[PDB]
Amino acid sequence: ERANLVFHNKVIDGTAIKRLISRLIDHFGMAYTSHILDQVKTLGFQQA
Amino acid sequence: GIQRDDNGRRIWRRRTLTKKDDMLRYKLQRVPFVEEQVRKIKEVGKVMTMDIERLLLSEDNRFEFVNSVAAEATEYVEKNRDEYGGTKKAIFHVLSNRVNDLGFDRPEAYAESDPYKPGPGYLKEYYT
Amino acid sequence: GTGFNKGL
Amino acid sequence: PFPLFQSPASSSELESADPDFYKIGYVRRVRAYGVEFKEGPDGFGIYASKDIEPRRRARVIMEIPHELMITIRQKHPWMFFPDIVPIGHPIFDIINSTDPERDWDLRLACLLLFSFDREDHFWRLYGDFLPAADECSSLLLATEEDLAELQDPQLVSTIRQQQKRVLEFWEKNWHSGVPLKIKRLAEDAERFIWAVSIAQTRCISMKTRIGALVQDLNMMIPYADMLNHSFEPNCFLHWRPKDRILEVMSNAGQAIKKGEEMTINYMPGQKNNMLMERYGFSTPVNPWDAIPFSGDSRIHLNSFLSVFNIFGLPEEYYHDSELSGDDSFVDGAVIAAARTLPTWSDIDLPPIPSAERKAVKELQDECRKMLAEYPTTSEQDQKLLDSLSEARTTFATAVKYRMHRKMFIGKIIKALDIYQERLLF
Amino acid sequence: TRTLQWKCVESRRDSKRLYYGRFILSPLMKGQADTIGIAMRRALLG
Amino acid sequence: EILQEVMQGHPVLLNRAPTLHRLGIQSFQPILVEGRTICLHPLVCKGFNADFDGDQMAVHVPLSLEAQAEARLLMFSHMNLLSPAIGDPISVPTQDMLIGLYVLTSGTRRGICANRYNPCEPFFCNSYDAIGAYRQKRINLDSPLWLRWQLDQRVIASKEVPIEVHYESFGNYHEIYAHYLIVRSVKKETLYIYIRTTVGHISFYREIEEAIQGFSQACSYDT
Amino acid sequence: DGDIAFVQSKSFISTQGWDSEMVVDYRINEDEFHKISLLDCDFFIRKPPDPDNDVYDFREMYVTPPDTDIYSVPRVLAPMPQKYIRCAMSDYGCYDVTEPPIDAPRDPLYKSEREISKVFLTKHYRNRRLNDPEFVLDFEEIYVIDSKTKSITRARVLVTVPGGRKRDRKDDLLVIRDNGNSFKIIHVGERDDPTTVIEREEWTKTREDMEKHLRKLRDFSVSNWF
Amino acid sequence: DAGYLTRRLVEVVQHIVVRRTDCGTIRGISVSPRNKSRMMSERIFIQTLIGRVLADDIYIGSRCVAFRNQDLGIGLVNRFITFGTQSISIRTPFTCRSTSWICRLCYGRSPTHGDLVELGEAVGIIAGQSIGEPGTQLTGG
Amino acid sequence: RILGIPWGFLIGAELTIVQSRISLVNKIQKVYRSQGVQIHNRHIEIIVR
């Protein structure tokens, strides 16, 4: 099932990512966001 | 209401979606490249994490839930002392059973083996 | 927490 | 025994539902586990896709998110959850100008018509799977031809009383001076009658906790109304408050076989006249159907209860299957006889078989009279239905209601017959 | 004790234009598995 | 081997002696690791304020089955993501994790920073080709590209009228927005959408979408 | 040529030459009118019967706030036609993709809605039907329905295609620009790439911003651009 | 200094635990959005009303938009601002009919779990740490 | 002195209590909001209570 996210196109920063985590928790729950954080952590570390 | 043809069989109007749903075409697709993620999640143990929350969704107080789990886990170990010591844990068996009670399928106590383990003396070193 | 009431 | 050697490759009236029916809900976080929707001449229905092996606790069958439903408080003030009516919308004045206890159906009909007009509302899609004016079995849509055939002055008077109440409400609130946003909801009087019929035949009252607030809501849950009614249901409705999900859960420790229909009890205990008035259907196995009877003659119900393996208090009358072995005769219909029949009982006083035998025929002597009161017989009506090929569905239900009542009289005649002879042993 | 052998552990075909396959190579001495995996990935992609 | 299976499923409590927050003590699932040092997750090292110029933690193993129950079900990091002070996330990416994401979403150079002179790009049918082309060094991370968008309008851009509408005489008209191109028609209702973006935005969007799908498939309640 | 059948109805009430900011007491039959829904107003244009809903009658038009019954008279700013014409209706606006607050569970992460600020009615050449093999849009006659002013006008269109009124319409390419105010007809072979259109607008904006940023330096007057 | 302040803060409320569902109070702190914006920002005014349990019904004309003992979300709070109501009474620890404990409704919605607080939560100690933890975080004229 | 014995102290003390409650929370929130620290009023009202 396709997830109805929002295609962030401009930029993400400390405040932008913090809002996204807040919205992901309030929509998918902490179990989903805990996995999303790990994928985000790997993506951020890899591209850095 | 009731309508039948010459043969006597009943003919009814097949209720079908007359209009068109936009979200129908935007959600039936599935991503093809999550084989490594789903394998990692099961191996790590995050599959129980979702199950733990799922049980809490139908619960009223999370402090009563853990007390009930601990009480049932103590009951399990008393009956079968020589089962919940190693690869199987008493608490994990309770969580797996409670998910299976809802009608879903999980491995017993979420226990997983290592199919690629070469020998008995070889233990999987973790790449820190 | 878990000690509220007596666990029952 | 190899799969290649084995060559695997009835119920024709039931066909699998349109895949879009589940898909339009599936995209809205609606999950049905182990069940599938099938449709037929009678209507929709949920049938198990596999054997449901019983577990320690109830098994989840279906989940419906709150945002897909239409909910209104049963008690004033009328607050709508998943709020769809905008502030200042004229439809709220129509809703607020209703009887607080008699017009619950009208307030749901206004929301139902309002939801169909809204473009973003889910019910504008789910409304296509609702039965039409002719397909709906509600007696509110029936005319005098079906009502006269119903053969029940009390039930007909109530139905015709509701028709006047609903029609006059439309006349008051859908005159020529209404705004177009209100007029387009009910372009003609007939549509509003259909809206009330859906509201009456599909409302599910339930006490739900939404956030920190607990209240009684006249809900309009989709995919859950499709569950048919049975006084011995195999599943029930449970409201999960943390995620605002309505769970359909099969009874704990009960096995459901492949293809078995999943049913819930719309009402705890009611007579067929109430079901016809509300939902427009009747069940011959209703354990609450009554019949007027003279109190002069009575029997020992304890003997009557035991001979059919009926146990428990009258509030919890039920039949034991394994004790009876097969006993194809006993059903929910004879359980109602244990209540509606005049009976006597002392602490432990045994009955007199001859006196009961003197009274069983006397009891059955009266029982033949009510069947003679109705000009048609139980088999005559069902034979007519098979011969009938072009008529309104409310006509069939009216036939069924009098047929079920006649059989209910016919069932107890046999019930007293077997009871009388079995009393000797 | 063992010799360097390979085997396909997973193989899925959940499309007509999407095939999946997982392969194991073992035993490998320290540092060789990374070299083989890096070069094979470059060969597979381009 | 016995120790490896014993720790499996038995949570332990990690405590920072100069305790700072409620997260100063927390429960993790231990895994036997090489070396003589305690490896710790980078995200939780911010909840512990665990600087890596020197730090030593005290670890306690719950013994009673009740203690092991509440350690796993109340103190695990996957159930404590919001700080009770105001209700804000605590495991927000920081340091080079935030730098890497910032670089990904730092899109194309625009205007005078992209062209030397006043003007006065590849089209990808799906995001997989855009990622694949990036792997094959065909395009850069910040190089602009057009992505054929099959979903609905989803990108967050400033609500502005199209920069320019190319209305063909046969009924097809293209609407050039600041960030996407929409091809509508009068005869038909095709509604073709092409998003002007980079691989970085696609990679970031795909990472979130794959994480959700990967978690859903692993926790397959449908079966 | 190809004039549409000038039929007459019974409810036809001509609104031409009426005050703009005044309402009409009576209520119109929406079935007889084209319903144009915009962000700030709902626009009604008389709809003569036709196999396809392409014929417009600008003799009587009404403007109302969105989903309201109190009709009014639009601020006509151009000589609207007195004959039935076939107009291709294409909206002009923006997508308001927003992130609503999440309070209820499973609330949408985003809310994508399209806001219409102007609507363009492009007359079919010789009132030819869409199904006609010789169909082509006559870009000379374009009418703009502005939501903000609740007014309808005629597009000021500049024709740059060589050939004059006798040119071949198949090579025309209307270029709407400047918030739906500048209409220019160019040859299809001169179409700008969508990448060029975006870069051209970005280059102009950033160049002006860079100059203002550098203007505050005290050696700006003795510096070059490059 | 902050560490010393934490010990005093947690001690005064170490005994406060959510022990009852609804204490049955009727008095609620009344807040109005029209006399407040003159001093503080509107954004923080939302946070004061987020997670609160309404102590009385709120009406807009004959329309009822919120009920007693109903949790306040961003959707309800934004509705109040748009339609300019002023008689907003909410349940706060000030309105609870106790000082050795606090009920779920009077406290409100737990920030961590996004739902009504659960019985037995050591909510006093949480409040103490929520204030002491930011302790280590606290010209042109 | 304006009100009687059973209500001179009843609402008089309440006025001091209520006025102090709103005053105390404002001053405490003034420090934290100035320093860019976001703390819900619940954690402060419990202390003030």
Ligand SMILES: Nc1ncnc2c1ncn2[C@@H]1O[C@H](CSCC[C@H](N)C(=O)O)[C@@H](O)[C@H]1O
């Ligand atoms: N047990 C039962 N026996 C007969 N009809 C039933 C029934 N339960 C429900 N119905 C029918 O369904 C109506 C209630 S709404 C239930 C949905 C309906 N069964 C459908 O197929 O769409 C009743 O008015 C009656 O017509």
Ligand SMILES: [Zn+2]
């Ligand atoms: Zn209280």
